[PDB]
Amino acid sequence: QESAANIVQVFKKAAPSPISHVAEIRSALEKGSRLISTMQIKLYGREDKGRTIKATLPYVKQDIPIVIVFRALGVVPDGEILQHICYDENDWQMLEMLKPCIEEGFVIQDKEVALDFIGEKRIQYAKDILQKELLPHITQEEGFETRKTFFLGYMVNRLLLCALERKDQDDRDHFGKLDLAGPLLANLFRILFRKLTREIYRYMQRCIELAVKSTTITSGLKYSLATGNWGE
């Protein structure tokens, strides 16, 4: 079973659309659960109107203007934000573009509020969606906030690198960018063993004082392989 993952793509979006260009990156843990949630680093304002940059996060209703995503990350001052996006103080064009964006977030001046506008109860959840949902590859650990930030920076960069005619729109069919048998059993087994896992949890939740039905991993496997329907 054959679009690769964990990679940056930039697409131009038709004349009829509030969005100009957008960059995406499909992410999933190469080993461990494997979430299928993608990152959207949009770029509103068509090639005219008086041009902000907002991005989409997993589980968040609306979209957030990149500046905040940074302060909410661990970078609170301007120019230290432009620090990550642009790598050449003498590239006024790009920087210019960013300007209007900075103004967007000029209203939130720190990490407190940063993680807030994302709706004590609410602030705590803000963190979560950043350590386990936001660009979840790289790692979902904790003390790496910095790293993801340079990415979201390398991303907001890739966006503009095109909206300024320096790099073309990503070639959707560049073959360089196959789950054989062995792998298949994997994603399959897990789905199974995991129902066995929380099955063995019930026998342990009745004994007010053997049980493991090793048939879910035998019969489960058979069903699939027999017909051709992977999923349970």
Partner 1 sequence: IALDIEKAKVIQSSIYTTLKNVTSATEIYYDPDPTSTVIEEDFDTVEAYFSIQSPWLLRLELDRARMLDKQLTMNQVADKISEVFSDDLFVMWSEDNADKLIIRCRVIAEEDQMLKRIEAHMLDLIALRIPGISKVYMVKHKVSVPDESGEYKNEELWALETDGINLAEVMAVPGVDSSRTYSNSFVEILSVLGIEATRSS
Partner 2 sequence: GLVCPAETPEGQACGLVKNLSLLSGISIGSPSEPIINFLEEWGMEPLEDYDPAQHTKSTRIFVNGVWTGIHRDPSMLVSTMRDLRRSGAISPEVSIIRDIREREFKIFTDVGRVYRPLFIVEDDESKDNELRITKEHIRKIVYGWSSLVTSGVIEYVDGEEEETIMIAMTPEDLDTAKRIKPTFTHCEIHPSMILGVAASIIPFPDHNQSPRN
Partner 3 sequence: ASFRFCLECNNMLYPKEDKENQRLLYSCRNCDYTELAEDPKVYRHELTNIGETAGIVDDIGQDPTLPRSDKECPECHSRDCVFFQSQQRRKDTNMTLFYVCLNCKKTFRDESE
The DSSP code sequence of 15-32 is: SSSSEEEEEEEEE--SSS
Q: Assess 165 for contact with partner 1 (CB under 8 A).
A: no
Nearer to partner 3, 101 or 135 (CB): 101
Instruction: Give the bridge partners for 65, in sequence order.
Output: 54
Q: Assess 92 for contact with partner 2 (CB under 8 A).
A: no
Question: By CB under 8 A, what part of segment 71-130 binds partner 3?
Answer: 77-80, 89-90, 92-93, 95-96, 99, 102-103, 106, 109
The DSSP code sequence of 187-225 is: HHHHHHHHHHHTTHHHHTTT-------TTTTHHHHHHHH
- 3-class DSSP state of 41: strand
Q: Assess 231 for contact with partner 1 (CB under 8 A).
A: no
For residue 78, the partner it binds in partner 2, partner 1, partner 3, none, with Cβ less than 5 to 8 A by kind, is partner 3
CA 228 to chain centre: 31
Rule CB under 8 A: choose which of 36, 178, 204, 210 binds partner 2: 178
Rule CB under 8 A: choose which of 16, 50, 182, 231 binds partner 1: 50
Up-side HSE of residue 214: CA atoms within 13 Å toward CB?
1
For strand 64-65 and strand 19-27, is the pairing parallel, antiparallel, or unpaired? Answer: unpaired
**How much of the chain is in helix, strand and coil states, percent to nearest 5?**
40, 10, 50
Give the interface with partner 3 as residue ranges (CB under 8 A). 77-80, 89-90, 92-93, 95-96, 99, 102-103, 106, 109, 165-168
The residues that touch partner 1, with contacts defined as CB under 8 A, are 48-50
In the complex, which residues of this chain contact partner 2 (CB under 8 A)? 2, 5-7, 30, 83, 87, 137-139, 146-147, 150-151, 154, 175-176, 178-180, 182-183
